Amino acid sequence: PLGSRMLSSDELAAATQGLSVNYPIGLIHPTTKENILSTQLLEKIAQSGLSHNEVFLVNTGDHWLLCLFYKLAEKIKCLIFNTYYDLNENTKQEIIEAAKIAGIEVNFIEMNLQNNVPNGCGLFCYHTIQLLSNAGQNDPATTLREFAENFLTLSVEEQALFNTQTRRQIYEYSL
């Protein structure tokens, strides 16, 4: 079903690389059980450097997480945007471990917005990245928070409308 389709890495990448946003990754590698987010960040610090806004799209199994690393101003801060059920504490501290490498408290923003947007984790990632790019110098923690709160105030018909419109734009990048 296209209406409840979970976005893959390539499908999410094609949309997010369309106009610093890193390629979508899995949090923990299945076989070697390494923290890919930690390894990716470490690799970054040794090469050129971390942008003023580092965006990671991290998959923790069924979640697409918006992971933002940003400086404000002398202190770098970490931001986790979850649009589904609350992450278990195990998954959380794998992110905290990666946050420390970036040079960091880890701000987990967790609000379930997918009651009417099935597997919409990738959809909110695509949409909020556009928000953060239109927000500029605005505090990203309050950009995403007020967006999620306002999204819950919408009716089912409006939420479902967001679901089909966003998917029609995202699917275009993969075609």
Curated annotation (Swiss-Prot):
It is found in: Secreted; Host cytoplasm. It is an enzyme of class 3 (hydrolase). One of its GO terms (molecular function) is cysteine-type peptidase activity. One of its GO terms (cellular component) is extracellular region. Keywords: Host cytoplasm, Hydrolase, Protease, Secreted, Thiol protease, Virulence. GO terms for biological process: proteolysis. Its EC number is 3.4.22.-. Changing C121A: Abolishes deubiquitinating activity. The keyword Zinc does not apply. Induction: Expression of the gene is induced inside phagocytic cells and is dependent on the SsrA/SsrB system. Highly expressed in host macrophages and when grown in an acidic environment. Belongs to the peptidase C79 family. Effector proteins function to alter host cell physiology and promote bacterial survival in host tissues. This protease targets the host cell ubiquitin pathway by acting as a deubiquitinase in infected host cells. Specifically hydrolyzes mono- and polyubiquitin substrates in vitro with a preference for 'Lys-63'-linked ubiquitin chains, suggesting that it interferes with a signaling pathway rather than inhibiting proteasomal-dependent degradation of its targets. Does not possess desumoylating activity. This is Deubiquitinase SseL. It comes from Salmonella typhimurium (strain LT2 / SGSC1412 / ATCC 700720).
